[PDB]
Amino acid sequence: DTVSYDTGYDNGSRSLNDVSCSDGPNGLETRYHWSTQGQIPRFPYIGGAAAVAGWNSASCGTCWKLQYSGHTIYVLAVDHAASGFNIALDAMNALTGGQAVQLGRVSATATQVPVKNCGL
Ligand SMILES: [Br-]
Ligand SMILES: [Br-]
Ligand SMILES: [Zn+2]
């Protein structure tokens, strides 16, 4: 799966209204009473995933194991992506040995896992 970064996910003050997984029954505001990205337990290990089709997706708040070049991170899906994953720059640096800006995008193995792995 293709993984890139988006510094929007590094902004702790960003309202969850600005990502797909806001309100509605499946939204993270509704389920966890978070109102910003910075309130998510393991922020900034968050991002968008194709599994999240948009608002009220049942895939909101799913946890994903991403593997690349010997590294493993776990990220919470909080937003839509057209394909693959877009994650915080900090998270992509962890995944790529600090080479995120240089690489831009990488091919990673992705696996859905229990949310305890994302600190929930
Ligand atoms: Br490394
Ligand atoms: Br290492
Ligand atoms: Zn390494």
DSSP-based three-state secondary structure for 82: coil
Structure tokens at 62: 């799913």
Tell me whether strands 71-80 and 85-87 are parallel, antiparallel or unpaired: unpaired
CA separation for the pair 42, 61 (Å, rounded):
12
How was this structure determined? It was done by X-ray
Q: From the CA of 30, how far away is ligand 2's center (Å)?
A: 37
CA separation for the pair 83, 66 (Å, rounded):
14
**Whether the Cβ atoms of residue 77 and residue 21 lie closer than 8 Å to each other:** yes
User: What domains, with CATH codes, occur in the chain?
Assistant: 1-120 (2.40.40.10)
The contacts of residue 64 (CB under 8 Å, 6+ apart) are 49, 74, 75, 76, 77, 85, 110, 111, 112, 113
Residue ranges of E strands in 28-83? 46-49, 63-68, 71-80
The contacts of residue 70 (CB under 8 Å, 6+ apart) are none
Q: From the CA of 50, how far away is ligand 1's center (Å)?
A: 27
Assess whether the previous peptide bond of 41 is cis (omega < 30° from 0).
no
Going 52 to 54 to 55 to 56, the CA torsion angle's sign is negative
- Report phi then psi at 108, rounded to 5: -125, 155
Give the resolution value in Å.
Answer: 1.4
**Whether the Cβ atoms of residue 50 and residue 82 lie closer than 8 Å to each other:** yes
**Rg for the chain, CA atoms, rounded:** 13
- Report phi then psi at 87, rounded to 5: -125, 170
Which ligand number lies closest to the CA of residue 97? 1
Structure tokens at 112: 């859905």
